[PDB]
Amino acid sequence: NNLYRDLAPVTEAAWAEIELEAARTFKRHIAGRRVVDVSDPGGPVTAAVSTGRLIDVKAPTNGVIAHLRASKPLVRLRVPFTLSRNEIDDVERGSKDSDWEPVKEAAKKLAFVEDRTIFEGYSAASIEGIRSASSNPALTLPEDPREIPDVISQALSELRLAGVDGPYSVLLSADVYTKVSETSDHGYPIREHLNRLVDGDIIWAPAIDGAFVLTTRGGDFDLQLGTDVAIGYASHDTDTVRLYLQETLTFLCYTAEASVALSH
Amino acid sequence: NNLYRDLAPVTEAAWAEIELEAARTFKRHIAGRRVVDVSDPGGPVTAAVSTGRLIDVKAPTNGVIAHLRASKPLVRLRVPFTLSRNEIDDVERGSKDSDWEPVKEAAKKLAFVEDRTIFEGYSAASIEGIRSASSNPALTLPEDPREIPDVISQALSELRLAGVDGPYSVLLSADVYTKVSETSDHGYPIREHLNRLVDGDIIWAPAIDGAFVLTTRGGDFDLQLGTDVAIGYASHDTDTVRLYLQETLTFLCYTAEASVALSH
Amino acid sequence: NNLYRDLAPVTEAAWAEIELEAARTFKRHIAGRRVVDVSDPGGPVTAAVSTGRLIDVKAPTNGVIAHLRASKPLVRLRVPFTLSRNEIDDVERGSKDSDWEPVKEAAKKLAFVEDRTIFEGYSAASIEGIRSASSNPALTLPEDPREIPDVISQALSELRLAGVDGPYSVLLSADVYTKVSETSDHGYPIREHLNRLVDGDIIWAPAIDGAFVLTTRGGDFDLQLGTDVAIGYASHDTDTVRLYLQETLTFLCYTAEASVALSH
């Protein structure tokens, strides 16, 4: 296929450790797929997702009414990374500490771009994120982290006022997640106060800004995958192998009132 | 074998009580084997652990490229102890309080050396401990023990920032473990506050200095055993038997970001 | 694996002729494996050979006796060679005289380095050769080749005085082997006089200096192989393919009195 993995000077044993480090780092830093509906991958051919809507377009002849079918394009996101060939060759010799730091940086970079796309949008790919598509009022996060469980309760009130009924999850940015993990009250971290407000999870979301409170009842948020994360080969020289991680996706939000966005 | 146990003036009943006291005291004072991967014992022959790496070495002839295979030597750690022969002979007569205090001191001594080796290093045996091999920033322990769950939360933040994903355990030195056990807050000991920060265990580590927070996801810390703890015979006279405890091991840390070291 | 043979622009038919020329030239120029015990290859992981001995090392704590396990490192010996791609491509077209001269030079180079290592030592790899480890007195080779069977008989006397009992082989350097092959006495070459002194073989050893007389009773000389001779791929351009021969080994001599070294 287009990955051209068989052309890489990378052993089968070294691929297994690269695949492990990429999958483990990506899953650690992905927060969007824990709350959105993730489709089955459509394959390499699929290029657009039908929205079912119509666009008025000028008729080619009188007596004819013409409409373009509306769709959302998929975006191919590629993160290159460079591995040392000495570190690759050490794997068959029995090394357990080969430097897969460029794999982990690329998986963290690809996980951030996917979560920035879902929550903050990526407008060049015609992706309105959850923050922009939310019709609930955007709340402000207080600087005192002990006041955060009040504002999360205010976000849960807006979802209750909007009429949505599902288990709620709270996604926190890396700064806010740290701040509620390290600040205590009544002998409990603030993050444990937040656990008891919601039936879903308090989710570490290191890509996003601020916070999000949303329902995970299903059918509101759609991550449409063309192809999921794959590792491909670009080139190599004597010392290095140029690889990449890539995935093809788009994100669709169908319910504007299913989420509350929070920021500073 | 080399233990020469059959030459000892030690009865079978007395061996069973010596083996029991040594195993119970060693397991009580070992903290490293609760968090590191412990290999199967390689046997008495094994002398080195391959690191899989290569060392540049001068070629014997031009047109030849030579590399030494790198490895880590195992270290044989022996702790002698002396038992009274009157206490040994009392066992067959039905004594239940024979003085196995030199067994317990030797097992505690051998357990401390193993845990100092894993965590603080033993540089003459080319063993970089967990504290020296950690790439996360070293935190300072506060003198007020009620402020310890904040600094443990700061250590958990560094591991979350490093990207590692497993159940975290906290290893406390004997001074710190006592101080968080004897200080209370909200009607709970500080050690119980620490239990609720982590999904792993709060571990009494009487050999180490300060504290350690690390993941136990697996594959990061490797205790390679040549031979595990065995009791051997050295010599005897009319009144005493000279014995020893010994084990052959080395320790390897493969993941620098899998641990946070804490000290005063 | 690390050889990356599938990336080479070398046909299956051309590999078969390269493998044949490398194996035939290596076996022609190897003399050490005819007299030493050659182990089964330990695999790519193995990095050291246990000597079973102990090294005094400073104890980490009082009351503890520490010893490092001693071992001998394996050395990876690589000989690069460059083949013409026109000569490679001629093989499928039915050529029988493709220039495998760089293969034969590399196999001769790798065979010499292995035999210099066994007999003359390679001290950077901590390999004491047979000549240095021999405790028998070193004899001098006479300039008259007709006087060589006397000095070989003197070497056989030293082995008889040392008490060793096995079939003796004589290894001659390329200069000495030529000189005893081309000089005649009583209508026989001097090499045929040497054949009748020993029950083993008179062995052409083109790598070594001088001569060696040793027993092949077994258990005295140990060639420990990690991986045996393999052909790997480095790189290629339009005109050439860069390949290499490599093997990983060390040599151990266990019996100092099992050999007599001879020189000029």
Side-chain angles (χ1 to χ4, degrees):
Chain A
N1 59 11
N2 287 328
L3 299 174
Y4 299 120
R5 286 167 64 92
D6 294 333
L7 301 180
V10 176
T11 66
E12 182 185 1
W15 279 115
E17 296 189 357
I18 292 160
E19 290 284 332
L20 190 146
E21 291 293 330
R24 184 175 66 182
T25 298
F26 188 76
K27 184 177 288 292
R28 176 58 175 170
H29 293 83
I30 279 296
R33 298 190 185 188
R34 293 176 65 186
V35 294
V36 309
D37 294 325
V38 177
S39 71
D40 292 331
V45 177
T46 179
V49 173
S50 178
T51 67
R53 290 181 183 270
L54 302 176
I55 302 167
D56 295 334
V57 71
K58 185 178 181 178
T61 309
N62 56 4
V64 180
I65 288 95
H67 288 92
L68 290 175
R69 292 297 302 266
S71 62
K72 289 291 185 181
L74 276 71
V75 62
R76 205 269 300 270
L77 298 167
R78 179 177 289 177
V79 180
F81 64 100
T82 296
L83 291 174
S84 173
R85 291 186 66 187
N86 289 322
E87 301 294 323
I88 291 167
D89 294 333
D90 287 332
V91 178
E92 180 176 355
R93 287 191 292 270
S95 177
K96 270 82 170 175
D97 59 350
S98 288
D99 182 69
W100 310 120
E101 184 176 0
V103 183
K104 292 186 284 187
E105 293 180 357
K108 183 175 176 179
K109 178 72 75 177
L110 182 61
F112 283 7
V113 171
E114 170 174 345
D115 281 334
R116 297 288 297 172
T117 297
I118 293 169
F119 293 95
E120 310 298 328
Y122 174 39
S123 67
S126 295
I127 294 170
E128 190 184 9
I130 288 174
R131 185 185 302 277
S132 173
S134 179
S135 66
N136 294 122
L139 295 175
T140 178
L141 288 168
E143 291 176 352
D144 190 2
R146 292 176 179 88
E147 294 175 350
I148 290 173
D150 289 332
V151 182
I152 297 301
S153 291
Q154 295 174 359
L156 294 170
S157 293
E158 297 183 359
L159 294 171
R160 184 177 61 248
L161 181 63
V164 300
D165 48 354
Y168 302 104
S169 291
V170 180
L171 287 87
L172 301 175
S173 67
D175 181 74
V176 174
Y177 193 92
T178 296
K179 195 182 291 184
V180 302
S181 295
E182 293 179 353
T183 304
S184 183
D185 199 1
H186 306 280
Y188 288 139
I190 300 298
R191 189 187 69 198
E192 175 61 30
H193 293 270
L194 299 176
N195 275 309
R196 298 181 295 186
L197 297 178
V198 298
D199 288 333
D201 198 72
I202 307 301
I203 295 170
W204 182 61
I208 70 167
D209 300 329
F212 286 90
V213 181
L214 44 84
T215 178
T216 62
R217 63 182 184 176
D220 298 325
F221 311 112
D222 195 1
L223 185 68
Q224 286 293 116
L225 294 180
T227 57
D228 204 353
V229 181
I231 310 178
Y233 166 73
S235 64
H236 68 276
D237 58 0
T238 299
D239 296 332
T240 59
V241 181
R242 282 88 163 91
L243 298 175
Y244 55 87
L245 307 180
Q246 74 180 3
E247 60 179 354
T248 303
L249 54 83
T250 188
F251 175 73
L252 289 84
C253 177
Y254 307 131
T255 305
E257 73 271 13
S259 66
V260 177
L262 291 84
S263 66
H264 292 289
Chain B
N1 59 11
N2 287 328
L3 299 174
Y4 299 120
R5 286 167 64 92
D6 294 333
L7 301 180
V10 176
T11 66
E12 182 185 1
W15 279 115
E17 296 189 357
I18 292 160
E19 290 284 332
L20 190 146
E21 291 293 330
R24 184 175 66 182
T25 298
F26 188 76
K27 184 177 288 292
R28 176 58 175 170
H29 293 83
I30 279 296
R33 298 190 185 188
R34 293 176 65 186
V35 294
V36 309
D37 294 325
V38 177
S39 71
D40 292 331
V45 177
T46 179
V49 173
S50 178
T51 67
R53 290 181 183 270
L54 302 176
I55 302 167
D56 295 334
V57 71
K58 185 178 181 178
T61 309
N62 56 4
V64 180
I65 288 95
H67 288 92
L68 290 175
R69 292 297 302 266
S71 62
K72 289 291 185 181
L74 276 71
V75 62
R76 205 269 300 270
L77 298 167
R78 179 177 289 177
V79 180
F81 64 100
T82 296
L83 291 174
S84 173
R85 291 186 66 187
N86 289 322
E87 301 294 323
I88 291 167
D89 294 333
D90 287 332
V91 179
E92 180 176 355
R93 287 191 292 270
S95 177
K96 270 82 170 175
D97 59 350
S98 288
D99 182 69
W100 310 120
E101 184 176 0
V103 183
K104 292 186 284 187
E105 293 180 357
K108 183 175 176 179
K109 178 72 75 177
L110 182 61
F112 282 7
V113 171
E114 170 174 345
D115 280 334
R116 297 288 297 172
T117 297
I118 293 169
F119 293 95
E120 310 298 328
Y122 174 40
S123 67
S126 295
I127 294 170
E128 190 184 9
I130 288 174
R131 185 185 302 277
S132 173
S134 179
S135 66
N136 294 122
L139 295 175
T140 178
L141 288 168
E143 291 176 352
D144 190 2
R146 292 176 179 88
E147 294 175 350
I148 290 173
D150 289 331
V151 182
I152 297 301
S153 291
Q154 295 174 0
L156 294 170
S157 293
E158 297 183 359
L159 294 171
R160 184 177 61 248
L161 181 63
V164 300
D165 48 354
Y168 302 104
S169 291
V170 180
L171 286 87
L172 301 175
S173 67
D175 181 74
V176 174
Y177 193 92
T178 296
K179 195 182 291 184
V180 302
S181 295
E182 293 179 353
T183 304
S184 183
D185 199 2
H186 306 280
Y188 288 139
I190 300 298
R191 189 187 69 198
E192 175 61 30
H193 294 270
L194 299 176
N195 275 309
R196 298 181 295 186
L197 297 178
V198 298
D199 289 333
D201 198 72
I202 307 301
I203 295 170
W204 182 60
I208 70 167
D209 300 329
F212 286 90
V213 181
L214 44 84
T215 178
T216 62
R217 63 182 184 176
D220 298 325
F221 311 112
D222 195 2
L223 185 68
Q224 286 293 116
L225 294 180
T227 57
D228 204 353
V229 181
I231 310 178
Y233 166 73
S235 64
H236 68 276
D237 58 0
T238 299
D239 296 332
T240 59
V241 181
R242 282 88 162 91
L243 298 175
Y244 55 87
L245 307 180
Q246 74 180 4
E247 60 179 355
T248 303
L249 54 83
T250 188
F251 175 72
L252 289 84
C253 177
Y254 307 131
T255 305
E257 73 271 13
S259 66
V260 177
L262 291 84
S263 67
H264 292 289
Chain C
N1 59 11
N2 287 328
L3 299 174
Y4 299 120
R5 286 167 64 92
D6 294 333
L7 301 180
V10 176
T11 66
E12 182 185 1
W15 279 115
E17 296 189 357
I18 292 160
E19 290 284 332
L20 190 146
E21 291 293 330
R24 184 175 66 182
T25 298
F26 188 76
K27 184 177 288 292
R28 176 58 175 170
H29 293 83
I30 279 296
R33 298 190 185 188
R34 293 176 65 186
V35 294
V36 309
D37 294 325
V38 177
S39 71
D40 292 331
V45 177
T46 179
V49 173
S50 178
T51 67
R53 290 181 183 270
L54 302 176
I55 302 167
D56 295 334
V57 71
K58 185 178 181 178
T61 309
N62 56 4
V64 180
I65 288 95
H67 288 92
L68 290 175
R69 292 297 302 266
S71 62
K72 289 291 185 181
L74 276 71
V75 62
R76 205 269 300 270
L77 298 167
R78 179 177 289 177
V79 180
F81 64 100
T82 296
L83 291 174
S84 173
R85 291 186 66 187
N86 289 322
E87 301 294 323
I88 291 167
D89 294 333
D90 287 332
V91 178
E92 180 176 355
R93 287 191 292 270
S95 177
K96 270 82 170 175
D97 59 350
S98 288
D99 182 69
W100 310 120
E101 184 176 1
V103 183
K104 292 186 284 187
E105 293 180 357
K108 183 175 176 179
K109 178 72 75 177
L110 182 61
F112 283 7
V113 171
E114 170 173 345
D115 281 334
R116 297 288 297 172
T117 297
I118 293 169
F119 293 95
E120 310 298 328
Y122 174 40
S123 67
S126 295
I127 294 170
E128 190 184 9
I130 288 174
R131 185 185 302 277
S132 173
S134 179
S135 66
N136 294 122
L139 296 175
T140 177
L141 288 168
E143 291 176 352
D144 190 2
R146 292 176 179 88
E147 294 175 350
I148 290 173
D150 289 332
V151 182
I152 297 301
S153 291
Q154 295 174 0
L156 294 170
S157 293
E158 297 183 359
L159 294 171
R160 184 177 61 248
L161 181 63
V164 300
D165 48 354
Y168 302 104
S169 291
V170 180
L171 286 87
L172 301 175
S173 67
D175 181 74
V176 174
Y177 193 92
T178 296
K179 195 182 291 184
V180 302
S181 295
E182 293 179 353
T183 304
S184 183
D185 199 1
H186 306 280
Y188 288 139
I190 300 298
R191 189 187 69 198
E192 175 61 30
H193 294 270
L194 299 176
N195 275 310
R196 298 181 295 186
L197 297 178
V198 298
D199 289 333
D201 198 72
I202 307 301
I203 296 170
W204 182 60
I208 70 167
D209 300 329
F212 286 90
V213 181
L214 44 84
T215 178
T216 62
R217 63 182 184 176
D220 298 325
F221 311 112
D222 195 1
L223 185 68
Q224 286 293 116
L225 294 180
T227 57
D228 204 353
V229 181
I231 310 178
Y233 166 73
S235 64
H236 68 276
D237 58 0
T238 299
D239 296 332
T240 59
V241 181
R242 282 88 162 91
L243 298 175
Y244 55 87
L245 307 180
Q246 74 180 3
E247 60 179 354
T248 303
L249 54 83
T250 188
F251 175 72
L252 289 84
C253 177
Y254 307 131
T255 305
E257 73 271 13
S259 66
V260 177
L262 291 84
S263 67
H264 292 289

